[PDB]
Design a protein around this nucleic acid. Structure first.
Length: 298
DNA sequence: GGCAGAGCCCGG
DNA sequence: CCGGGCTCTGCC
């Protein structure tokens, strides 16, 4: 007769998918083979409400198969698309959500309604006439946000606000820009992350002011596990990069313990001036590092 | 963590 | 204006 795999191959070919991409994908997701011709075709039609071509859709399924084959809830999916569009999100935003936070659409419509309802309350109470732009800007900058609880999101905003003594305008920029991903963290973790940074930098001599600015200038520092932030700075000072230095160029903490290490062990171990070079290159790309250590030899 | 395009700033 | 070196920024 005809197998589960047969149906999906047929379907997928009729969408413009190479026999290879089809095989690729199929190996990666067993449960893909268990959706019906009908279900599939409705999911695809729905995805085409956002995605503009079957081609685009395909790339996605090739990088991200669970993205499509996970849920078989077309009604939920359909209502979320309707609702999200209705509150005035843009095709791009929905595409970004699709490709970054797919479970948004397998979500409960009530949940998304609740967060948008919240996001509206927030743009408002931050001195925004029409909160519509705020909501769009925040969802575009943090597409993982609709899959958070409003309690989490609500607490993290309050946390930023009072820790940092930010006003409405200052808080707004924070959460639509640098501190955006922060709202997706467990509140408790966020509260302990920053507590550790404070204790760790103070013990190195830093002031309140100096700490606030440090975290404000690169909020994603709060993501580092405590031991991993602690370990990392301990390393930078063994190589005797100065705290001031660590603080002035915060993104060096993006490198891993082993990488920055073995790179000054060639900038100072070879011959240069550590406490004068802006260690921005430290974090830099290999291709992008080698080429400056080049002009730095002479 | 690594990476490099887009755009920006500086010596020329 | 222009040619390169760097940052900011957002994808793998």
């Amino acid at each position: 007769m005809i197998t589960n795999e047969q149906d999906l191959k047929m379907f997928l070919l009729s969408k413009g998918a190479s026999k290879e991409v089809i095989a690729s994908i199929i190996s990666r997701y067993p449960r893909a083979i268990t959706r019906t011709p009908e279900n599939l075709s409705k999911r695809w039609d729905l995805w085409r409400k956002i995605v503009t071509s079957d081609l685009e859709i395909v790339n996605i399924l090739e990088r991200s198969p669970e993205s499509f084959f996970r849920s078989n809830n077309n009604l939920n999916l359909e209502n979320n698309i309707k609702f999200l569009y209705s509150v005035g999100l843009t095709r791009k935003c929905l595409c970004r959500l699709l490709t970054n936070a797919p479970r948004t659409f397998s979500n409960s419509l009530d949940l998304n309604k609740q967060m948008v309802e919240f996001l509206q309350a927030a743009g408002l109470s931050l001195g925004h006439n029409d909160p519509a732009d705020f909501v769009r800007k925040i969802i575009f900058k943090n597409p993982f946000i609709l899959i958070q609880s409003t309690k989490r999101v609500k607490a993290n905003i309050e946390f930023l606000r009072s820790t940092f003594n930010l006003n409405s305008e200052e808080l707004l920029v924070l959460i639509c820009g640098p501190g955006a991903e922060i709202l997706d963290l467990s509140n408790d973790y966020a509260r302990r992350s920053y507590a550790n940074i404070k204790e760790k930098l103070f013990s190195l001599g830093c002031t309140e002011e100096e700490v606030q600015k440090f975290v404000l200038s690169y909020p994603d520092v709060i993501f580092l596990a405590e031991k991993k932030f602690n370990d990392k700075i301990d390393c930078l000072m063994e190589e005797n990069i100065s705290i001031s230095q660590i603080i002035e160029n915060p993104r060096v903490l993006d490198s891993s313990i082993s990488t920055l290490k073995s790179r000054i062990k060639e900038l100072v171990n070879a011959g240069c001036n550590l406490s004068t070079l802006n260690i921005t290159l430290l974090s830099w790309s290999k291709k992008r590092y080698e080429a400056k250590l080049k002009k730095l030899s002479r």
